[PDB]
Amino acid sequence: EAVKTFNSELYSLNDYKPPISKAKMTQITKAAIKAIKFYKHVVQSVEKFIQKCKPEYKVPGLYVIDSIVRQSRHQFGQEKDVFAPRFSNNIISTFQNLYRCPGDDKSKIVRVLNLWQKNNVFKSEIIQPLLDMAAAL
Numbered sequence: 001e002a003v004k005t006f007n008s009e010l011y012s013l014n015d016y017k018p019p020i021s022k023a024k025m026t027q028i029t030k031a032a033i034k035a036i037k038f039y040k041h042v043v044q045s046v047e048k049f050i051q052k053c054k055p056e057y058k059v060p061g062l063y064v065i066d067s068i069v070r071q072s073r074h075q076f077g078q079e080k081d082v083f084a085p086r087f088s089n090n091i092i093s094t095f096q097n098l099y100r101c102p103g104d105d106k107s108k109i110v111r112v113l114n115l116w117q118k119n120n121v122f123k124s125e126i127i128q129p130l131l132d133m134a135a136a137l
């Protein structure tokens, strides 16, 4: 139900040509956060979206992760945020999927990683392999 509403908004990305509207991203993020009880379902849905989506939607999918983790850290506290730790479990595979984006979108991913590193959204042991994966392409 809370997960149904989130899935609905997430998959609605398919109706749009990137870049995605701020208002749409906000709606997806707010739905994720309202559904914090079901954070595992939320993370699983985002990961599935990114695995299966067309190449033009990989960066939008990453922005969904970025938007959820930023809002959750702001709203619940960096130490208490449940989203970044849960996304970390499969993150190497998530990014393997993300890097199968158009070559003109690769820089957008590295930008996100650079900001995550600066703000310590993940520790170096997670961020560095993700940075290494960009360089290896």
Ligand SMILES: [N+]
Binding pocket: 048, 049, 050, 051, 052, 053, 054
């Ligand atoms: N998808």
Ligand SMILES: [N+]
Binding pocket: 055, 056, 057, 058, 059, 060, 101, 102, 105
């Ligand atoms: N993309």
Ligand SMILES: [N+]
Binding pocket: 076, 080, 081, 082
């Ligand atoms: N939290």
Ligand SMILES: [N+]
Binding pocket: 036, 072, 073, 076, 080, 081, 082, 083
């Ligand atoms: N959280």
Ligand SMILES: [N+]
Binding pocket: 047, 086, 087, 088, 089, 090, 091, 092, 094
């Ligand atoms: N992930």
Ligand SMILES: [N+]
Binding pocket: 066, 111, 112, 113, 115, 116
């Ligand atoms: N970021």
